[PDB]
C-alpha cells in the first residue's frame, strides 16, 4: 500500500529554446497497489472537460501505475495558467500542478517617489508626495501600494490611479498629502509596493534633503533687439548658488502668475565646487510690452527669506 | 517505417518554479523492434552513461523505448543543449532540448551618436559611436558592422568589448567619418548580430534634416553679489538656431578653457521656430587681471562664414 506518487512531465523545447505547436502534459501516478484510481484535470482550480485527456493503466507484477495525457495549444500554455492533476485513491486526494516557468531574467520594474514642490510646500501649503510605478504586467488588482511614516504616525488618505498603458504595460500612481510641518521637521515618508511578479517587495523612501541650506541669488534679463525680425522680445532669468536643489520658479505679470507652458525652465544643475543653478526663459509679446513694461521672475526656495521667496524684475528702458 | 523520438522534461510547479533536479526523458516510439541504441550528448558531446538509464515496453506491434537522464537545476540553468541520439539499424534519429527561452527579457539597448560641430568643423576629424549595452556577458559572440547608404566603403572602426560589473557586456565601436561626406547626405549604418538577438539590430545616423539657421549670441556679467568680491559669474545665451547640434566653449587670453570649467545646457525646445541653449562660466581674481575679456564661442553648422560665432564680454 505505497501512497502513490504523482508527477507531471511536459513537451520540452527545441534545441534553440523555442516552444512546440502543442504542449503535452503527462500526469504519472506510479508505485501503487491496484484499485480505484481517479484522475482529474483542473485549470486554475476550475474543471475542464474529460474529452481533452486520455488514461492508460498498466499493472506490472504486484505494483501498479497509471498515466494520463492532456494536450494544450501553445497559446493556452503561454497564457500562464496553473494546470492541476488530481488523483483520488482510497478516499485520499493527491495532486501535482504545473504552469510555465518563470523568465530567468525578465524586465524589471521602476518605482519613482517625488518630493513636494517648494511652491506647493511654502505657498499653497498643501504639499503632496507622489509614488509612481511603471512596467508592471497589465493586470489590475494584483498591485498593492501602502504609505508609512518612520515615526509610525498615522497618514492621510491617499488617492490611487491604475492605468493600462499603450505598450501593454500598467502604470500605478498613488499621491499623498503630507502634514506640512512634518515634512520640514524630519520625517521620512515610505511607499511600499508588492506584486506577485516581483521577487521582493519594492520600498521607496522620501524626505527633506539634509544638507547646508543656502538661499538663491536671482538676476533678471532680456535680449537686445534683433530688430525687423518679428516683434516683441525674449527674456530670461539666472537663479543660483542655492542649497539644497529643491526649487520652484515662476513668472508673473502685474501679479498674474503665468502658465508653466509659457516659460521653459531648466532642472537644477550642479556647479563645480559648491551650489546649484537654474536658468529660465520667457518670450514676451508686444501687447504686454507697452501694457506695463515690468516683468517678474520669482524663485520659491526653502532658504529664501522672509517668505521663502525671492523676487526680481526687468523691462526695456 | 522509421521510429520517432520526442523528449519530455520535469515540469515547474504551480508557482512556475523549477525543482532541484530536471529529469529529461527520451521516448522512441512506433517502430520495428530489435537493436536500439541511445546516446546522450551534452552540448554536442557524449555523456557518462551512469545517470542515463533505458527501458522498453511493447504490446503487439507497438514498441516504445525510453531513456532517462537526470540533471541538476544548476546544469539545466547553465544554458546547455541536450541531444538525444538514437541508433537504429545503423541509422541515427535526433531530438535536442534546451531550457525554454524567456518570454519578456530586457532586452538590449543601442545608441548611435552624431559627431559634434566641434569635431566636424574646428578640429576636423569627426566620428560617430555605436554603443550597445546589456548584452550577455560572453565575448566573441557579437558582430558589429558599419556601412553607408551610398554603398561606398567605410574607414576602419575601433571596437571595445568590455564586461560590466553588473553582469552585462558593453560593446562599443567608433567610426571615423569623412568630414565632407557627412555634410553631403550620407547616412551611416550600425549593425549588431548576437545569438541572443531574435533579430539583428540596426541604428543609423545622419545630418539632421531641416531649414539651417545661424545662432544668436548674448554674453554677460553678473551684478556683484555680497560677500564674493573675487568670484564673478558670466553668462551666454545662444538662441534660434537649427538643427539642434551645437558646440560651445570659452576663451581666456585667446586659449580654449577646459570643457569642465563651464556648464552648457542641452539644446531644448523653443516655443516658436528654432532651438536655444545657455552656458555659464565662473571666473575669479587671477582671471580678473590677466586681461579682463572673455569669449563665449559657439560652433554651429549655419554659423558663417567660418562655421563659428563668438561674442565677447567683460567687467
Amino acid at each position: 500500500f505505497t501512497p502513490p506518487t504523482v508527477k507531471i512531465l511536459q513537451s520540452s523545447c527545441d534545441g534553440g529554446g523555442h516552444f512546440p505547436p502543442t504542449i503535452q502534459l503527462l500526469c504519472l501516478v506510479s508505485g501503487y497497489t491496484p484499485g480505484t484510481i481517479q484522475i482529474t484535470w483542473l485549470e486554475d482550480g476550475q474543471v475542464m472537460d474529460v474529452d481533452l485527456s486520455t488514461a492508460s493503466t498498466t499493472q506490472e507484477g504486484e505494483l501498479a501505475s497509471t498515466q494520463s495525457e492532456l494536450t494544450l495549444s501553445q497559446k493556452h500554455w503561454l497564457s500562464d495558467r496553473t494546470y492541476t492533476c488530481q488523483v483520488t485513491y482510497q478516499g485520499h486526494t493527491f495532486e501535482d500542478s504545473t504552469k510555465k516557468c518563470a523568465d530567468s531574467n525578465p524586465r524589471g520594474v521602476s518605482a519613482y517617489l517625488s518630493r513636494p514642490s517648494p511652491f506647493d510646500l511654502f505657498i499653497r501649503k498643501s504639499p503632496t508626495i507622489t509614488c509612481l510605478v511603471v512596467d508592471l504586467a497589465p493586470s489590475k488588482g494584483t498591485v498593492q501600494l501602502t504609505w508609512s511614516r518612520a515615526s509610525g504616525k498615522p497618514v492621510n488618505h491617499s488617492t490611487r490611479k491604475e492605468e493600462k498603458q499603450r505598450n501593454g504595460t500598467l502604470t500605478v500612481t498613488s499621491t499623498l498629502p503630507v502634514g506640512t510641518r512634518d515634512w520640514i521637521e524630519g520625517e521620512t515618508y515610505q511607499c511600499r509596493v508588492t506584486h506577485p511578479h516581483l521577487p521582493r517587495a519594492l520600498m521607496r523612501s522620501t524626505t527633506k534633503t539634509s544638507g547646508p541650506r543656502a538661499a538663491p541669488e536671482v538676476y533678471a534679463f532680456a535680449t537686445p533687439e534683433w530688430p525687423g525680425s518679428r516683434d516683441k522680445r525674449t527674456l530670461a532669468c539666472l537663479i543660483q548658488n542655492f542649497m539644497p536643489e529643491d526649487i520652484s520658479v515662476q513668472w508673473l505679470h502685474n501679479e498674474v502668475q503665468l502658465p508653466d507652458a509659457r516659460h521653459s525652465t531648466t532642472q537644477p544643475r550642479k556647479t563645480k565646487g559648491s551650489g546649484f543653478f537654474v536658468f529660465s526663459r520667457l518670450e514676451v509679446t508686444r501687447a504686454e510690452w507697452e501694457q506695463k513694461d515690468e516683468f517678474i521672475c520669482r524663485a520659491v526656495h526653502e532658504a529664501a527669506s522672509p517668505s521663502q521667496t525671492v523676487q526680481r524684475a526687468v523691462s526695456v528702458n | 517505417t522509421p521510429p520517432t523520438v520526442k523528449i519530455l522534461q520535469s515540469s515547474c510547479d504551480g508557482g512556475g518554479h523549477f525543482p532541484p533536479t530536471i529529469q529529461l526523458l527520451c521516448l522512441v516510439s512506433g517502430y520495428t523492434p530489435g537493436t536500439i541504441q541511445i546516446t546522450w550528448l551534452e552540448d554536442g558531446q557524449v555523456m557518462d552513461v551512469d545517470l542515463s538509464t533505458a527501458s522498453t515496453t511493447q504490446e503487439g506491434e507497438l514498441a516504445s523505448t525510453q531513456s532517462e537522464l537526470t540533471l541538476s537545476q544548476k546544469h539545466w540553468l547553465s544554458d546547455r543543449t541536450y541531444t538525444c541520439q538514437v541508433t537504429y539499424q545503423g541509422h541515427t534519429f535526433e531530438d535536442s532540448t534546451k531550457k525554454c527561452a524567456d518570454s519578456n527579457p530586457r532586452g538590449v539597448s543601442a545608441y548611435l551618436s552624431r559627431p559634434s560641430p566641434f569635431d566636424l568643423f574646428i578640429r576636423k576629424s569627426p566620428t560617430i559611436t555605436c554603443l550597445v549595452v546589456d548584452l550577455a556577458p560572453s565575448k566573441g559572440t557579437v558582430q558589429l558592422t558599419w556601412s553607408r547608404a551610398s554603398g561606398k566603403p567605410v574607414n576602419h572602426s575601433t571596437r571595445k568589448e568590455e564586461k560590466q560589473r553588473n553582469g552585462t557586456l558593453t560593446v562599443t565601436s567608433t567610426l571615423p567619418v569623412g568630414t565632407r561626406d557627412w555634410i553631403e547626405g550620407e547616412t551611416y549604418q550600425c549593425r549588431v548580430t548576437h545569438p541572443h538577438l531574435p533579430r539583428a539590430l540596426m541604428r543609423s545616423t545622419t545630418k539632421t534634416s531641416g531649414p539651417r539657421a545661424a545662432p544668436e549670441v548674448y554674453a554677460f556679467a553678473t551684478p556683484e553679489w555680497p560677500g564674493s568680491r573675487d568670484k564673478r559669474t558670466l553668462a551666454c545665451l545662444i538662441q534660434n538656431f537649427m538643427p539642434e547640434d551645437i558646440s560651445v566653449q570659452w576663451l581666456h587670453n585667446e586659449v580654449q578653457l577646459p570643457d569642465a570649467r563651464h556648464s552648457t545646457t542641452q539644446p531644448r525646445k523653443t516655443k516658436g521656430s528654432g532651438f536655444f541653449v545657455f552656458s555659464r562660466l565662473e571666473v575669479t581674481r587671477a582671471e580678473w587681471e590677466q586681461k579682463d575679456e572673455f569669449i563665449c564661442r559657439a560652433v554651429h553648422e549655419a554659423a558663417s562664414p567660418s562655421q563659428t560665432v563668438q561674442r565677447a564680454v567683460s567687467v
Partner: antibody, heavy 127, light 112 residues
C-alpha cells in the same frame, strides 16, 4: 521591411461568423515591443478599431468594447500570423477590414503608432 | 452610435495656403496620452503622418505638423498640393477604455 497579408472569405451569411487571418513577415506575432490590431472601415461608421493582441510575459488581448461580446483575436504562433473572428454578423458588419502593426519607432520611443497596414479585405454580409 | 474623438467632417484649401484640422477628446485619451494622425486616399490603406502629438517619421513631409493642448489637438498642413485631397484621421490611446479610439474623419477638399 515588414509586411502584412490579409486573407479570408469576402461573403458571410447573416448570423454566421467572419474569419480573416493576417500573416506577417519582417517581425514576429510573439514579439514584445509591438502589438497586433484588427480595424475596419465603412463609409457609415468611419474608421473603427476592433482589437489587439500581443505578448509580454503572457498573451494579452484588448478588444473594442464596443463589441467584445462577439469578437476573438488570437495568434497562430507557429505560422507567425494572427486571426480575427467575429460572431453573429449583420449587414452593419460590412466593411473593409485592416490588420495593422502598432509598435514603436525608435530613440526616445515608448511611442506607439500603427505604422504598417494590410491592403484591406472586403467582407459583405448577405443571404 | 457615433465616434469617440470629435473632428469636423469637412475642411478646405487653396493650392498655396495652410489649413488645420481639429481633434477633441477627453483626459482619458488626449489628456494623459499622445495623438496620431493618418492619411487615407481611399481604396488604399491609411498611412501614418504624425505620432505622439509632435513627431514625423521617415518618408514624411515637414509641411505636415501637429500640436496638442489639454483635451484637444491640431493637424497643420501648409503649402498644399493636388494629392493632398484625402480623408484625414486622428486617434489616441484611451486608458479608461483600454483601447484605441479614433476620430470621425475629416474630408479635405482643395479647390482652385
Amino acid at each position: 521591411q515588414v509586411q502584412l497579408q490579409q486573407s479570408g472569405p469576402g461573403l458571410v451569411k447573416p448570423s454566421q461568423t467572419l474569419s480573416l487571418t493576417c500573416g506577417i513577415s519582417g517581425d514576429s506575432v510573439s514579439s514584445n515591443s509591438a502589438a497586433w490590431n484588427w480595424l475596419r472601415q465603412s463609409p457609415s461608421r468611419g474608421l473603427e478599431w476592433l482589437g489587439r493582441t500581443y505578448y509580454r510575459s503572457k498573451w494579452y488581448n484588448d478588444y473594442a468594447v464596443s463589441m467584445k461580446s462577439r469578437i476573438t483575436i488570437n495568434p497562430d504562433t507557429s505560422r507567425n500570423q494572427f486571426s480575427l473572428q467575429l460572431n453573429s454578423v449583420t449587414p452593419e458588419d460590412t466593411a473593409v477590414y485592416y490588420c495593422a502593426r502598432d509598435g514603436e519607432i525608435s530613440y526616445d520611443y515608448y511611442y506607439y503608432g500603427m505604422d504598417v497596414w494590410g491592403r484591406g479585405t472586403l467582407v459583405t454580409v448577405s443571404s | 452610435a457615433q465616434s469617440v474623438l470629435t473632428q469636423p467632417p469637412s475642411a478646405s484649401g487653396t493650392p498655396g495656403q495652410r489649413v488645420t484640422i481639429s481633434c477633441s477628446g477627453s483626459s482619458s485619451n488626449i489628456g494623459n496620452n499622445g495623438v496620431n494622425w493618418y492619411q487615407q486616399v481611399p481604396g488604399k490603406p491609411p498611412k501614418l503622418l504624425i505620432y505622439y502629438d509632435d513627431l514625423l517619421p521617415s518618408g514624411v513631409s515637414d509641411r505636415f505638423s501637429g500640436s496638442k493642448s489639454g483635451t484637444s489637438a491640431s493637424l497643420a498642413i501648409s503649402g498644399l498640393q493636388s494629392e493632398d485631397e484625402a480623408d484625414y484621421y486622428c486617434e489616441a490611446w484611451d486608458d479608461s477604455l483600454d483601447g484605441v479610439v479614433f476620430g470621425g474623419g475629416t474630408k479635405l477638399t482643395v479647390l482652385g
